[PDB]
Each structure stands twice: as structure tokens, then as C-alpha cells.
């Protein structure tokens, strides 16, 4: 990339790729904000078994990750990488992208996330028995909410979360470094043109997302230990490939 035309082509290519893989449209998510779980329904979610509640969440996460894989597949430059590196990037990146994607389905005014056709708070997930993980994610979404991301910005930031050259296990580090740079050039160019460079200093560190993914795996290992048959029998294969690591 040695011209503004090219970089702006990358910006639009990446935005278009996000649009075609966003899973849930921004309009749809906003149009459902007044559709909030009643207290009878919340109490019902809390009275669900730990293992079923873990199972439902694992199913929805896995469903979300499939769209991140497709985003990655349609991402400019990704399919030209060797698959070893495609898998290294997606193993380490998928969950992270989903965590960033989740702020679109988060309402800062009441602190609720869209879950199974309605919005609900942190207390909706109390059956899981992982209060810290939940609080952390809700806070993570709350702080991304404060940046008022556009769809374009979401797309470029998530592309950069996925195309990280510092993941251990990359056989073609230099190639991934080059892609990252171009996506970074695109992201920063978009932010410059749109007078939004101020958010740069407000993006959370790489360590924050990693801390959230680390926590997710910790809590799974604790649940895995309590209900090993449910994980084998009732959890999605892709979830276990990415997180269970047996």
C-alpha cells in the first residue's frame, strides 16, 4: 500500500466484510432495547441449573464465533496465509472479536446485554457461578459503549484484533506483520478522515482482552471438573476445540 486509494479500498473492503458477517444488525439490536426480561423471567434464568446455563451460553458463543470465522474468511489477506496461521489466529482471536462485537448488543443506559431475544442484566447469568467473569465482560462492554463506535470502526478494530502478528505459533510472522500494518494504516486513515483519532488513546490494552479470554478458560476448567459428562455430551464441538483443550 503506497497510496490513499489503495488504503481506502482496504477500509471499504473490511467494512463490507463486517457487514456481511455481523450476525445481528445494529438496527435490529437498537429496535429491541425496550424488550427487557421481566423479574419473573430473570428469576427463572437464575433457577436454571448451572450446567444448562453454561450449555446455553456455550451454544450462543459458538454460534457467534462461526460468524467471526466467516468474517475472517472474507477478510482481505487472511485466506492467503497458510492454514496453520489461519488456525493460530482464530484459536487466539475468535473469542476476543466476539467480546468486542458484543458491545453492539449492550445498552449502557440500563447495563443490559441482548440474550435470547431480550435484554437482561448481570443477574440474569448468576446460575453460571462465575460472577467476576460476568462483571468483567459487562464492564468491558460498558467502556466500549462509551466510545460510540461506528459500524466502520468496529469492523476495522476487530480486523486488527484478529490479525495480530504477536500470537505464538505463527509460521509466517512477517506476512502477518505486513497484513496488520496495512489494516492499521487503514484504521488510522479512517479515524483521521472522520476526525475520530481521539478514541485511539481510549481503546483498552491488548492485555485486557487476553485477561478476559484467560478468565473464560479458567472458569470453564472449573465447570469441566464438576460436569465432565455434560461438556462431552452437551457442549458444541467447536467450543471444546477452542477452549476445553483436553
Amino acid at each position: 500500500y503506497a497510496s490513499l486509494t489503495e488504503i481506502e479500498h482496504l477500509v471499504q473492503s473490511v467494512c463490507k466484510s463486517y457487514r456481511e458477517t455481523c450476525q445481528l444488525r445494529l438496527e435490529d439490536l437498537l429496535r429491541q432495547r425496550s424488550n427487557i426480561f421481566s423479574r419473573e423471567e430473570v428469576t427463572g434464568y437464575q433457577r436454571k441449573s448451572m450446567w444448562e446455563m453454561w450449555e446455553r451460553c456455550a451454544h450462543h458463543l459458538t454460534e457467534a464465533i462461526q460468524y467471526v470465522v466467516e468474517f475472517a474468511k472474507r477478510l482481505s489477506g487472511f485466506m492467503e496465509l497458510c492454514q496453520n496461521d489461519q488456525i493460530v489466529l482464530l484459536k487466539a482471536g475468535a473469542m476476543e472479536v466476539v467480546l468486542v462485537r458484543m458491545c453492539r448488543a449492550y445498552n449502557a443506559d440500563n447495563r443490559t446485554v441482548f440474550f435470547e431475544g431480550k435484554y437482561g442484566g448481570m443477574e440474569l447469568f448468576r446460575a453460571l457461578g462465575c460472577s467476576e467473569l460476568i462483571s468483567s465482560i459487562f464492564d468491558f462492554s460498558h467502556s466500549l459503549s462509551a466510545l460510540h463506535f461506528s459500524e466502520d470502526e468496529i469492523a476495522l478494530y476487530t480486523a486488527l484484533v484478529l490479525i495480530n502478528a504477536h500470537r505464538p505459533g505463527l509460521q509466517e510472522k512477517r506476512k502477518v506483520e505486513q497484513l496488520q500494518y496495512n489494516l492499521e494504516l487503514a484504521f488510522h486513515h479512517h479515524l483521521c478522515k472522520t476526525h475520530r483519532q481521539s478514541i485511539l488513546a481510549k481503546l483498552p490494552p491488548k492485555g485486557k482482552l487476553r485477561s478476559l479470554c484467560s478468565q473464560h478458560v479458567e472458569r470453564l476448567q472449573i465447570f469441566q471438573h464438576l460436569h465432565p459428562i455434560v461438556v462431552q455430551a452437551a457442549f458444541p464441538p467447536l467450543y471444546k476445540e477452542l477452549f476445553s483443550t483436553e
Partner: peptide
């Protein structure tokens, strides 16, 4: 199960 990614990518 496992090795789902490979299948998803090749498709």
C-alpha cells in the same frame, strides 16, 4: 469433538 476450524476454513 475437535478440528472443526479446519473444516470451516476449507469450505
Amino acid at each position: 469433538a475437535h478440528k472443526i476450524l479446519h473444516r470451516l476454513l476449507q469450505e
